[PDB]
Design a protein around this ligand. Sequence first.
Ligand SMILES: [Zn+2]
Ligand SMILES: [Zn+2]
Length: 50
Amino acid sequence: DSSESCWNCGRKASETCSGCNTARYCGSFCQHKDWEKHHHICGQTLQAQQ
Ligand SMILES: [Zn+2]
Ligand SMILES: [Zn+2]
């Protein structure tokens, strides 16, 4: 676990998952690339989609 780094790039991240406020990324593309994997642990905080 790096200090404020992109979950994919490994360099640096500025954006944060708006759905869980946890995941961090440097861009929209990075979020989409990891998004597929992200759904494995995302969507279990608010529980709206059901
Ligand atoms: Zn990135
Ligand atoms: Zn998320």
